[PDB]
Design a protein around this ligand. Structure first.
Ligand SMILES: O=C1N=c2ccccc2=C1c1[nH]c2ccccc2c1NOCC[C@H](O)CO
Ligand SMILES: O=C1N=c2ccccc2=C1c1[nH]c2ccccc2c1NOCC[C@H](O)CO
Lengths: 311, 312
C-alpha cells in the first residue's frame, strides 16, 4: 500500500520503479520469490553498503507464494544506455567523461573490497548514471558474495564479456581481483565502442583474450589457477593497435595496469585513482570525487591518499 | 533467526524484550519480539527506521518468525536510569548534580531531535532512559508508544500512565503537542533531585491534585491552553520548589525546573534553548560526547542558540 507501482525495469524476480505514497520520492523495488525460512544473501549484503557511489538500501518487507520486496535508492539511467546512444549518434564518449565514470567505479569497488565483498557481475547494465551530475552508482548485488579467503568457492560463474580469465579456467580460489578485470573490460568498451572479448563459451572467450594479450606463461597459469594445460603460442599485441586511432597514452597505460593475467598484480582501486590518467580531474560536469567518509579515510593508505587528492 | 542467540529477558511488555547475540560478529543487541500481522504496517518499526542520533537507540536489523512475530534488533545499552536512581537511594546518597546535568542534557538533545521530525515519545520515564556507566552516555529507547503528531489532525485521549503525563493529558486533551515530552523531562529531572517522583497517584484526578498542591491552581487562561474543550477546582497558591526539594539544591537547578514545568504547553522551555540554559554552564566551562552535532542537527538549531550551547 505504501508503494505505488511504476514501470518495469527488468526481470528469481522482477525490478520496478515505485513511489513512496507519503514522501512522493521515487525508489527501485526488487521483488524476489523467497522462503522466510532461509536468509536472503542479497538483502544481507545490501544492509552493509553505505557509500556515495553505491546504491543504498532504503526499506524491505514481505508479501503475497511468498516474496521479499527490497526498496533501494534510484538513479535514472544505465551506462549501457549512454554507451549505446553514443554509438547511435556516431561519436565517441569524451575521454573526460569516461574518466569521470571510471574513477567513481574504482571508488565503489575499493569500498566493497575493504569489506571482503565481491560483486562478480560488474557490467554497463549494472552501472547507474545520472545525466545531471555524471554521478555513477554500482547496483544489483544479487550475484555478489563475501569471499572468505580461507575457503574455496565452487566454479559456477558463466557470463559474456566481463569475466576474469581465472573464472574461465575454473578457478576455485579466485579473489575480489576478479572485479578489477571487469572494470578493465568496461573501461575498454567505453573507449572502443564495443566489447573487448566476445564469445559464447569459456574457450571462445579465452581464445579472444589470448588473441590480444598473448598466450599466458606457465607462471601466469598457476597464478590464475594452480589446479589446471596447453594453447598455441601467440605474442601479445599493443593496445594502441587495437583501440581507435585517437586514444590518449595515459588511457592505455592505465588499461595496461588493469588487464593483467596475474590476479594479484592488477592495480589496486585507490592506486588507480592516484594514476596520472585522472590528473585532469584533480586539476578541478563533475560530481563529488573527494568527499571521503571517515571510513574511507581509515582505509586509504597515506602515500596513496596524497596522490589521489588535489594540491 | 539463526543469526541471533538468546538472550536474558529484559521485560515482557504485545511481546517480549531480550538480550541477543550476533553469532557472526559477537556483538550484543536488544531484541523486541511482538505479535504482528504481516497484513498491516507496524508503527514502531516505521519510527525506528528514521531515528539516527547519538542519544537515541538505533535500529539494527528486523525479520519475521513463527502466530506470526516481528523481530526488532536494536542498539544495546547495559543499564537504565531507573536502576541508577534506585541504587543511589539504597546507598543513602543523592545523585551528584554534576552527574544529573550530564543525563538531562543528553535527554534534551534526544528530544530536540525527535521533535524536529514531529515525532513525540509519549512515555518518557527512567525505565526508558538507558545509561552506560563507562561513559555516562544516556539513550532514549522503546518507541512502542511513540507517534508522529500531525498538527492539523486531532488525536484521541487514551494515554493513561503514572507519574510522568502532562497535565493536558490528565485533562483529556485532543490537540496535545510534542510539548508533552518536555513535561515528562521536567518530572524526571525533578525526581533525580528529590529522591522520589514529583506527582504520584493512581487516577487522573489524583495526579492533577498533586500537581495543583505544589504548583497552584491553574488560571482560566491556563485551562484553555491545556484543553479548550474543558470546570472548577479549589483555589490553591503555588508553593516554592525551594521548600519542596532537598536543603542543598542549587538555584540554577530550580530555575531550569521552573522553565520546564509550566502549565501552558506552548511556554515550556524548548530543548535547544534548555541546553543553552546557564545550569549547563559547568559542562561548557569544563563526561560523554555533548557537542558533536550532526550535519542535520546543525541545520535546525538556530544561530544565536547554537553559540550559547557551545563552549567559548
Ligand atoms: O536505480 C536502480 N536501483 C537498482 C537496484 C537494483 C537493481 C536495479 C536498480 C536500478 C535501476 N535504475 C535504472 C534506471 C534506468 C534503467 C534501469 C534501471 C535499473 N535497473 O535495471 C534493471 C535490472 C536488470 O535486471 C540488470 O541491472
Ligand atoms: O538496550 C536496550 N535497547 C532497547 C530497545 C528497546 C527496548 C529496550 C532496550 C534496551 C534495554 N537495555 C537494558 C539494560 C538493562 C535493563 C533493561 C534494558 C533494556 N530494556 O529492558 C526493557 C525496557 C523496560 O521499559 C525497562 O525495564
Amino acid at each position: 500500500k505504501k508503494y505505488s507501482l511504476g514501470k518495469t525495469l527488468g526481470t528469481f524476480g522482477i525490478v520496478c520503479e515505485v513511489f513512496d505514497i507519503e514522501s512522493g520520492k521515487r525508489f527501485a523495488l526488487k521483488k524476489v520469490l523467497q522462503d522466510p525460512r532461509y536468509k536472503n544473501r542479497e538483502l544481507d549484503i545490501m544492509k552493509v553498503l553505505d557509500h556515495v557511489n553505491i546504491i543504498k538500501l532504503v526499506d524491505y518487507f514481505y508479501t503475497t507464494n511468498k516474496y521479499l520486496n527490497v526498496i533501494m535508492e534510484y538513479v535514472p539511467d544505465t551506462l549501457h544506455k549512454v554507451l549505446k546512444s553514443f554509438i547511435r549518434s556516431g561519436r565517441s564518449i569524451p575521454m573526460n567523461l569516461i574518466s569521470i565514470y571510471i574513477y567513481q567505479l574504482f571508488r565503489a569497488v575499493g569500498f566493497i573490497h575493504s569489506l571482503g565483498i565481491c560483486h562478480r557481475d560488474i557490467k554497463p547494465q549494472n552501472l547507474l548514471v545520472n545525466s545531471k551530475d555524471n554521478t555513477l552508482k554500482l547496483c544489483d548485488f544479487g550475484s555478489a558474495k563475501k569471499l572468505i579467503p580461507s575457503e574455496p568457492s565452487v566454479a559456477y560463474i558463466c557470463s559474456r564479456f566481463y569475466r576474469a580469465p581465472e573464472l574461465m579456467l575454473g578457478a576455485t580460489e579466485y579473489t575480489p581481483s576478479i572485479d578489477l578485470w571487469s572494470i578493465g573490460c568496461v573501461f575498454g568498451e567505453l573507449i572502443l565502442g564495443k566489447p573487448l572479448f566476445s564469445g559464447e563459451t569459456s574457450i571462445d572467450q579465452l581464445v579472444r583474450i589470448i588473441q590480444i594479450m598473448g598466450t599466458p606463461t606457465k607462471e601466469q597459469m598457476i597464478r590464475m589457477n594452480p589446479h589446471y594445460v596447453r594453447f598455441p603460442t601467440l605474442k601479445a599485441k599493443d593496445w594502441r593497435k587495437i583501440l581507435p586511432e585517437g586514444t590518449p597514452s595515459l588511457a592505455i597505460d592505465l588499461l595496461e595496469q588493469i588487464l593483467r593475467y596475474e590476479p594479484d598484480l592488477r592495480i589496486n582501486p585507490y592506486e588507480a585513482m592516484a594514476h596520472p590518467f585522472f590528473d585532469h580531474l584533480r586539476n578541478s560536469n563533475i560530481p563529488q570525487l573527494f568527499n571521503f567518509s571517515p571510513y574511507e579515510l581509515s582505509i586509504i593508505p597515506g602515500n596513496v591518499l596524497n596522490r589521489i587528492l588535489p594540491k
